[PDB]
């Protein structure tokens, strides 16, 4: 009872607990057409359709209140996680492979240039960050890892990372839960 169930739903909990199947890559994976901190086409600029389709209306809700966001990094491999956990633990003198959300193709991470595109905690304190925070849902996002919640979701705050889990957003974001606690996983 370490694999994750229903792995490819919107709604799957995929965490240190819940892994997904290493064979697992989505076949609906599309670029959204929004702006990237990054150039060229790499595997990070792919999401799940639907969630690529979400992504560009979060991105233009923003540019409505003058909010300008860049997408920095979304899908990933099971393949490239075991690299990056392994390189990632011997610089010692990250999640491991198949425990990382990223990896259902509906995880973004997502920053400005008010935070120099960088995926770190005083991007919460800029205008753009707050009003992720409150506006995400709007277009099915939650932040997946809330302030005080890594006791539940086993990762510190972190304001830069969207998941993308459709109409349930809005009432996980006003009953301030947590995906684990939302889905009773
Ligand atoms: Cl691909
Ligand atoms: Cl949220
Ligand atoms: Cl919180
Ligand atoms: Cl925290």
Same mark, same amino acid.
């Given at each position: ?30 670029? /959204? #057409?929004? /702006?990237? =901190? ?5 595997? $990070? =600029?792919?999401?799940? @359709? ?13 540019? $409505? ?38 990896? *259902? ?7 400005? $240039?008010?935070?120099? #595109? %960088? !995926?770190? !905690?005083?991007?919460?304190? *800029? @205008? %753009?960050?707050?009003?992720? @925070? ?5 277009? &099915?996002?939650?932040?997946?890892? /809330? ?6 979701? &086993? ?23 947590? !995906?684990? %606690?939302?889905?009773? !996983?």
């Amino acid at each position: 009872s370490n694999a994750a169930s229903s792995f490819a739903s919107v709604q799957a909990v995929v965490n240190k607990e819940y892994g997904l199947p290493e064979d697992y890559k989505p076949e609906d994976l599309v670029v /959204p #057409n929004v /702006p990237f =901190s990054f150039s060229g086409t790499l595997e $990070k =600029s792919y999401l799940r @359709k639907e969630a690529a389709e979400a992504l560009e209306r979060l991105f233009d809700l923003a540019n $409505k209140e003058g909010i300008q966001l860049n997408a920095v990094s979304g899908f990933r491999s099971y393949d490239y996680q075991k690299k990056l956990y392994a390189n990632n633990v011997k610089r010692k003198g990250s999640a491991k492979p198949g425990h990382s959300e990223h990896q *259902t193709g509906l995880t973004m991470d997502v920053s400005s $240039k008010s935070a120099n #595109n %960088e !995926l770190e !905690l005083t991007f919460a304190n *800029t @205008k %753009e960050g707050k009003w992720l @925070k409150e506006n995400a849902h709007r277009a &099915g996002f939650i932040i997946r890892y /809330p302030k005080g919640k890594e006791s539940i979701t &086993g990762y510190a705050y972190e304001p830069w990372h969207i998941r993308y889990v459709g109409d349930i957003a809005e009432s996980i974001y006003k009953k301030k839960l947590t !995906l684990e %606690e939302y889905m009773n !996983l």
